[PDB]
Amino acid sequence: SQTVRVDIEKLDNLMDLMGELVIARSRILETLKKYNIKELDESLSHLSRITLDLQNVVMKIRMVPISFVFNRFPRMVRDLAKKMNKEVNFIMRGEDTELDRTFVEEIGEPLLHLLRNAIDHGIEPKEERIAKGKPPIGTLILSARHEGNNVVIEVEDDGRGIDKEKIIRKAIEKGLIDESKAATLSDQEILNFLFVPGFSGVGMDVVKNVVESLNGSMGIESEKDKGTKVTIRLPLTLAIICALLVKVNNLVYAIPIANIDTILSISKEDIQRVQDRDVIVIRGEVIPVYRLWEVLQIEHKEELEEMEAVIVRVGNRKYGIVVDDLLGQDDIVIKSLGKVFSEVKEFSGAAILGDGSIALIINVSGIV
């Protein structure tokens, strides 16, 4: 039995292609469910059979059980526990959950930081433990599982929580928070502060950096004196999302339909500048407009008296993206270029359109 040296790029093409295939299949299947010709069904079923089996084989080439990374943790946790004179009940779940070989080497250290973090500022000393009337032995859980097109990983504990007020008063000092906008902030955007470089040595920002370079996402959930639950979501296979194709200076960009609110057709008189940015008011609501070409360091090419503004949506605050044209909707395959786009504020990645072409994905959050 032999093996062959295969370039990592080739395995990436296979991945993209498979994702493309998933979409092609699905579409041809949907555009002809009405016809009820037995000969046709049997051909469709064959296509799907081969398509599904093809995806399987690519997965086998790329997948690996998360055991690889998980296995070394109990001992490390056992030892981190000794140094900090505190006993902990460590529990791992779904160690057999499979993920991309690429992830094993990289997710290892970020996961350790979360476990260590839990053992320091999570689980409290036996003194506090008893004062709050919580069990003497603390609980630390590392979970792994599949959900949709994501390899989900969570680290849970019954520590001291986070105390959101600690973050508010601490954030009011340096930059961002004023004070009256803090009392109007969502509960997740305070736990999100935890990622800003100036807070809380390694931090917590560096962990999210890694998970993002892998095209994954990180989340925090905590309750004062109850515990903390940090979630990491990793792509299982490539991500397929519906997007709005937009044209600017003849180039095509994609805006995730998920973030889109409604599309306007604003004019020049319709714009009014207030200090640093331009804005439009819609039903008494102030929405800051941004010309995509100004954001991408590009040039003007005939200012159309009637412009089109894709009004986007961030958690609680919304904006507007003025573009040249609106090509239409499209199901697209997001490429594994995490390392590449994680450094760019303007884009969140590159996608593969049905066309067969590549379009950058406008990163709405990075344009505020």
Between residues 41 and 325, which has the closer beta carbon with respect to a second copy?
41
Q: Alpha-carbon distance 300 to 322, whole Å?
A: 12
Interface of this chain with a second copy, residues 62 to 81, rule: CB under 8 A: 62
On the CB side of 53, CA atoms within 13 Å amount to 6
Q: Alpha-carbon distance 279 to 277, whole Å?
A: 7
Q: Is 44 an interacting residue with respect to a second copy (CB under 8 A)? A: yes
Between residues 43 and 249, which has the closer beta carbon with respect to a second copy?
43
Stretch that binds a second copy, among 50-58, 168-176, 270-278, 299-307 (CB under 8 A): 50-58
Interface of this chain with a second copy, residues 1 to 30, rule: CB under 8 A: 1-11, 13-14, 17-18, 20-21, 23-25, 27-28
Stretch that binds a second copy, among 38-46, 247-255, 277-285, 341-349 (CB under 8 A): 38-46
242, interface contact from Hg ion, a second copy, none, CB < 5-8 Å by kind: Hg ion
Q: Is 330 an interacting residue with respect to a second copy (CB under 8 A)? A: no
Mask for 318-337, x = binds Hg ion (CB under 5 A): -----------x-x------
31, interface contact from a second copy, Hg ion, none, CB < 5-8 Å by kind: a second copy
Between residues 216 and 338, which has the closer beta carbon with respect to a second copy?
338
CB of 241 to Hg ion, least distance (A): 9
- Residues 6-35 as b or e (16 or more Cβ within 10 Å = b): eeeeebbebbbbbbbbbbebeeeeeeeeee
308, interface contact from a second copy, Hg ion, none, CB < 5-8 Å by kind: none
331, interface contact from Hg ion, a second copy, none, CB < 5-8 Å by kind: Hg ion
Sign of CA dihedral 156, 162, 164, 170: negative
Between residues 282 and 327, which has the closer beta carbon with respect to a second copy?
327
Q: Is 33 an interacting residue with respect to a second copy (CB under 8 A)? A: no
What is the arrangement of strands in the sheet containing 285-291, beginning at the earlier edge strand?
260-264, 308-314, 317-323, 285-291, 277-282, 272-274
Stretch that binds Hg ion, among 8-16, 85-93, 123-131, 242-250 (CB under 5 A): 242-250
In a 10 Å sphere around its CB, with 0-12 CB exposed, 13-18 middle and 19+ buried, how is residue 126 labelled?
Answer: middle
Between residues 24 and 326, which has the closer beta carbon with respect to a second copy?
24
Between residues 108 and 354, which has the closer beta carbon with respect to a second copy?
354
Q: Alpha-carbon distance 16 to 290, whole Å?
A: 32
In a 10 Å sphere around its CB, with 0-12 CB exposed, 13-18 middle and 19+ buried, how is residue 49 labelled?
Answer: exposed
Written as six digits, the tokens of 13 are 């093409």
Q: Find, among 355, 367, 351, the residue nearest to 253 by Cα.
A: 351
C-alpha distances in Å from residue 83, one per residue of 79, 86, 119, 128, 134: 7, 8, 10, 18, 22
Q: Alpha-carbon distance 368 to 350, whole Å?
A: 20
Q: Find, among 153, 84, 71, the residue nearest to 122 by Cα.
A: 84
Q: Alpha-carbon distance 141 to 73, whole Å?
A: 11
329, interface contact from Hg ion, a second copy, none, CB < 5-8 Å by kind: Hg ion
Q: Is 242 an interacting residue with respect to Hg ion (CB under 5 A)? A: yes
Q: Which residues bind a second copy (CB under 8 A)?
A: 1-11, 13-14, 17-18, 20-21, 23-25, 27-28, 31-32, 34-35, 37, 39-40, 43-44, 46-47, 49-51, 53-54, 57-58, 60-62, 101, 354, 356
